[PDB]
């Protein structure tokens, strides 16, 4: 219920690292070379700024699995990457990262861009660095891309990037629209600083500053004076009346922020800044309360999963022994219709939950809720086979996409990531067959293997072609046998009339007929 941007700026200013990074950067500027040192238990990588630079602007040399090549490739400037390559700081940090737990990369202008790119390379790896990485670069150029910014956004590494820019600094402002900001950008002023996390808010602030007539060429001395006065601001307080103080907390906080950044409350540009600060903070219901409502919705949906489990048990107990997957594929009883009702209700609920998870109306640690992970795992184990059975029933013969190659709900991907977040499963030998199949795509792979075997028996008569097909089916049947031995498949797979049994019989007959045994 308060414009915390000023509070966040004050928190970051009061931090000793705010002054330590500035001191390290000044020492590096005096030295002119890469400075590695440890102050107050924290190590700072201080890359000196390079005067000459031309930031005009998959990667064989650069290892950044976070670039998100699937989305339009991020246009990283040629100068920044060519510098990162040519200073050869990689060997240096690898021989310096040994036995370190906390590191705060520091830089200024081009040095700040170097620090930001080095950090981005550090976190954008297959394995995250053991040492915690932070960025305190100030004055760095706005170089970047919308794709790169959104990649850092979904990577949840924007918070690790903190940048301080003065109200009169032009180096970040003088950039092309192709360079999109990412991370936390703070617009420090003489009176106070304001933190802006939203990329759109930062872009709007940059635009309004460009329209503003700010003329300060010697930005280094301004940065020094600003860090000094901000470090020594907590000692002396002020009235902070903000002229006519509004009764409303939101308006009063916004006006205080506007006064802190220098602009007058009644100034026209000050009024625009007031409006953008008002629009900066999103007004939604508290995520903690929404978590409880999601818990209640999960409790309400749970009986539908109980009824779908009851249907599965009844289908298993059926005398036909056809298999609940095959029973759902051959929908002739109203039970299939109502169980489709239940599964569609579950799918709708879980899609809503995942969508709201993505949009951030919930605590960031929602996936780490343990209970939600187990609920998602149970849902996936009890629903997805039926979803793929329905898809295959509605799948035309010409529709060869199957379920492995696309046509898989994104909710299942997110659930798979959440189960990737669980502890290591205990390798306890199952006394009896598992209640549900551990693999959530086993049936689709079985369907693909059935298609391959049918192709073999109606094509590839050429022994070698058939032989290659047999070589294709043998690893899958070996995998299935291993799954059976560990008892990771329910009784439906072992059903006499089950698709798996018929497929195995056809495989045995084909092996006998070609004489491919052993």
């Amino acid at each position: 219920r308060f414009e915390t941007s000023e509070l966040q700026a004050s928190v970051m200013i009061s931090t000793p690292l705010f002054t330590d990074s500035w001191s390290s950067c000044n020492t590096a500027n005096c030295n002119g070379s890469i400075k590695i040192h440890d102050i107050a238990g924290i190590t700072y990588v201080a890359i000196p700024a390079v005067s000459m630079i031309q930031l005009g602007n998959v990667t064989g040399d650069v290892l950044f699995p976070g670039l998100s090549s699937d989305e339009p490739l991020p246009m990283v400037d040629a100068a920044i990457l060519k510098l990162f390559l040519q200073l050869k700081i990689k060997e240096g940090l690898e021989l310096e990262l040994l036995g370190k737990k906390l590191v705060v990369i520091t830089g200024h202008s081009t040095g700040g861009a170097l620090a930001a790119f080095t950090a981005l390379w550090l976190l954008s790896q297959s394995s995250p660095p053991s040492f915690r990485v932070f960025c305190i670069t100030f004055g760095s150029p706005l170089l970047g891309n919308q794709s790169l910014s959104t990649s850092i956004s979904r990577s949840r590494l924007a918070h690790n990037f903190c940048h301080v820019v003065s109200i009169h600094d032009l180096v970040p402002r003088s950039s092309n629209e192709q360079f999109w900001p990412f991370g936390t950008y703070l617009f420090c002023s003489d009176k106070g600083g304001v933190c802006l996390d939203n990329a759109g808010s930062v872009r709007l602030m940059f635009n309004i500053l460009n329209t503003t007539a700010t003329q300060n060429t010697e930005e280094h001395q301004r940065y020094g004076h600003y860090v000094f006065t901000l470090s020594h601001m907590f000692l002396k307080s002020r009235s902070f009346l903000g002229g006519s103080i509004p009764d409303n907390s939101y308006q009063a906080g916004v006006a205080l922020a506007v006064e802190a950044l220098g602009f007058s409350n009644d100034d026209t540009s000050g009024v625009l800044v007031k409006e953008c600060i008002e629009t900066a903070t999103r007004i939604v219901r508290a995520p903690i309360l929404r978590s409880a409502e999601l818990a209640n919705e999960l409790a309400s949906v749970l009986p539908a999963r109980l009824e779908i489990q009851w249907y599965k048990d009844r289908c298993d107990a059926s005398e036909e022994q056809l298999g609940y997957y095959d029973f759902f594929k051959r929908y002739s009883l109203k039970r299939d219709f109502k169980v489709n009702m239940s599964r569609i209700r579950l799918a709708k609920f879980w899609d809503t939950v995942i969508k709201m998870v993505e949009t951030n109306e919930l605590p960031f640690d929602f996936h780490l809720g343990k209970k939600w992970i187990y609920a998602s795992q149970f849902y996936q184990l009890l629903a997805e086979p039926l979803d793929i059975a329905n898809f295959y029933k509605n799948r035309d013969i010409k529709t060869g996409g199957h379920y492995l190659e696309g046509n898989r709900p994104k909710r299942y991907e997110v659930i798979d990531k959440w189960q990737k977040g669980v502890k290591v499963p205990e390798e306890c030998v199952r006394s009896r067959y598992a209640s549900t199949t551990q693999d959530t795509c086993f049936w689709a792979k079985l369907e693909q293997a059935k298609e391959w075997l049918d192709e073999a028996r109606k094509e590839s008569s050429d022994p070698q072609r058939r032989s290659l097909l047999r070589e294709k089916i043998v690893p899958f049947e070996s995998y299935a046998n291993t799954l059976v031995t560990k008892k990771e498949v329910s009784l439906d797979v072992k059903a006499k009339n089950s698709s798996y049994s018929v497929w195995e019989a056809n495989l045995k007959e084909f092996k006998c007929k070609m004489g491919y045994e052993n």
């Binding site: 009824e307 249907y311 002739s332 039970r335 109502k338 489709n340 009702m341 569609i344 709708k348």
Partner: protein, 414 residues
């Protein structure tokens, strides 16, 4: 058994005969109430109200064993879970009567077991069709054509039970001078095929139609205009070929199918042909997960008296043409997951008198629905009670009926 005869005598012919013919239905299979009153009307010419009164008259007796009566919510509500159970001794009493055998007549015909072996009447063509107004043929996989000639000089009612697959249409329909009732049921676990449908197309006096679990024949102009048909019910029948037949306008060929019933059927990609009819009076599409949008060209069906929906999750919501029917008096919408913000917009739907929603995801209704002055018999669910109250404030005739959902395992068995 003697008390059964006494009770039959107590019932006057108007009801006694109705019962006797009702006992001729498959004993193991359930009997729909709508089908029962249909055959009762087409045989004894009793009105619908008289048929309902006779149903009650049998109900007070222990002979009738109705499944349930959830249609009590409103008279507008159509027959719901009203299947009736009878006694085999009661059918044995009909056999003990041997009215067909005693009079050597083709009326009151029944053969149990639905055995392929046809009766002595079919044998050596001993089927003396003295009077065939009543016809109940129970068959399994034997030739529907039978092994004799059934001219049916006077046969207003006919039924047929079957199973297996790839069946054929018997020429008895073509031989029949007149007939008004036709019932075919397939007991197999797979949809059944039909051949030679032109035999049933020879006659143009049929008045009722009811089929189950059979591949429906195409709706071409080969069928002679059925200007006396008024009822059409489809159960578990894939209509992929027979539908999308808008080239042949159903109304233009015949005023047949004034009311239509679809249940537990899929592959209904479109519905243009259904809405192309001009003589339709009632429509009920239930248990169809293959419907996404009701066509906006429903202005042809302007006499529609009731529209009922029971199961259609893919349907996003109701269209805006719902409030364009001055004859729509009853609406049912339940068990529809995708019904968020149901656009009833019942400002021009004042004809609507009763609205039922056992369970729904309705999230919002226009103020026009509150303007509706005839929103009585509101069988609403537990949720959306605030909105019913809002409507109650403007129109106190709401007559709300909060629906408490119950859960049973009876759905688990068949």
């Amino acid at each position: 058994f003697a008390h059964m005869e006494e009770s039959l005598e107590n019932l006057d012919p108007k009801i006694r005969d109705c019962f006797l013919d009702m006992g001729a239905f498959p004993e193991d299979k359930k009997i729909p109430l709508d089908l029962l009153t249909s055959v009762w009307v087409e045989r004894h010419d009793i009105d619908e109200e008289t048929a309902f009164s006779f149903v009650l008259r049998l109900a007070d007796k222990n002979l009738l064993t109705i499944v349930n009566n959830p249609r009590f919510g409103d008279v507008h509500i159509g027959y719901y879970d009203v299947f009736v159970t009878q006694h085999d001794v009661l059918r044995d009493l009909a056999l003990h009567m041997s009215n067909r055998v005693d009079v050597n007549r083709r009326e009151r015909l029944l053969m149990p077991k639905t055995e392929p072996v046809l009766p002595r009447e079919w044998e050596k063509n001993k089927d003396e069709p003295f009077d065939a107004k009543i016809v109940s043929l129970h068959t399994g996989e034997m030739d529907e054509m039978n092994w004799f000639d059934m001219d049916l000089p006077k046969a207003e009612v006919l039924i047929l039970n079957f199973s297996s697959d790839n069946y054929v249409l018997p020429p008895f329909i073509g031989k029949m001078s007149r007939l008004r009732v036709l019932v075919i049921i397939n007991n197999g676990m797979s949809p059944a095929r039909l051949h030679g449908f032109s035999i049933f197309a020879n006659l143009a006096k049929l008045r009722s139609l009811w089929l189950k679990r059979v591949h429906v024949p195409e709706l071409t102009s080969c069928t002679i205009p059925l200007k006396n048909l008024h009822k059409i019910h489809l159960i578990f029948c894939k209509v992929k070929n027979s539908f999308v037949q808008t080239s042949f306008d159903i109304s233009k060929i015949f005023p047949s199918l004034s009311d239509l019933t679809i249940d537990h059927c899929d592959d209904l990609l479109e519905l243009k042909s259904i809405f192309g009819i001009t003589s339709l009076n009632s429509l009920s599409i239930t248990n169809c997960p293959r419907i996404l949008e009701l066509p906006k060209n429903l202005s042809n069906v302007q006499s529609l008296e009731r529209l009922r929906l029971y199961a259609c999750p893919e349907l996003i919501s109701l269209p805006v043409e719902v409030c364009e029917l001055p004859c729509l008096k009853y609406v049912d919408i339940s068990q529809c997951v995708s019904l968020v913000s149901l656009p009833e917009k019942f400002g021009k739907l004042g004809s609507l008198e009763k609205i039922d929603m056992r369970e729904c995801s309705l999230l919002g209704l226009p103020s026009s629905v509150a303007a509706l002055v005839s929103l009585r018999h509101v069988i609403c669910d537990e949720e959306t009670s605030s909105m019913w109250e809002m409507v109650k404030k403007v129109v106190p005739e709401l007559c709300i009926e909060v629906a408490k959902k119950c859960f049973t395992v009876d759905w688990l068995d068949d």
